[PDB]
Amino acid sequence: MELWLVRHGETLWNREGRLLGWTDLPLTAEGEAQARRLKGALPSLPAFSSDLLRARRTAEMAGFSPRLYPELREIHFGALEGALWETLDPRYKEALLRFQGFHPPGGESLSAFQERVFRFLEGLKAPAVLFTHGGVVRAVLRALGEDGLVPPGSAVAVDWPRRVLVRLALD
Numbered sequence: 001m002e003l004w005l006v007r008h009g010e011t012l013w014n015r016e017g018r019l020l021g022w023t024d025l026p027l028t029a030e031g032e033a034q035a036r037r038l039k040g041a042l043p044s045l046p047a048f049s050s051d052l053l054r055a056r057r058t059a060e061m062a063g064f065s066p067r068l069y070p071e072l073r074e075i076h077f078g079a080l081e082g083a084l085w086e087t088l089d090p091r092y093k094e095a096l097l098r099f100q101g102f103h104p105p106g107g108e109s110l111s112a113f114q115e116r117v118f119r120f121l122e123g124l125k126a127p128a129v130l131f132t133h134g135g136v137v138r139a140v141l142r143a144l145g146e147d148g149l150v151p152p153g154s155a156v157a158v159d160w161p162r163r164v165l166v167r168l169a170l171d
Helices: 012-016 029-038 053-061 090-098 110-122 134-143
Strands: 002-007 047-049 128-132 155-159 163-168
Touching: 002 134, 029 053, 047 053, 053 128, 110 134, 128 134, 134 155
Parallel strands: 002 128, 047 128
Antiparallel strands: 002 155, 155 163
16 A cells, blocks of 8 residues: 655754654744645645644645544653653663664553554555654654654655655755
């Protein structure tokens, strides 16, 4: 199934290097610009989006009117929301790097996060564009055997659940 996953435009915590999950930050000026550039670069397909501001706003500026689904939200970092990556305990950095065994206090485990994301994707019965977050895109890319790192305001098209089709980044 052809699915286009879009990572929302940048927020302040991107440059700051802080874990950004359910904290509802707005897009930066550049983030809005990144979103605008997506308009005309994404196919005209039904759209879905994380209900968090940065995602919804990216969808809007990209020319879409997506249906909102909390299932497309970034992982909930719980007590680690806003934590500087730099000062993250080595155990947490390792869990996030290897994408396994991560369960922050008051948050969501990486296993539950994957279950949520994949169950949502499994329910899509036709091609669509999904405005989401870096962690969601990474979960999908990793599950497809590829490095899940893509810049803010960039997109990746995949044939779920078989392979990555293309990665799109604009300057």
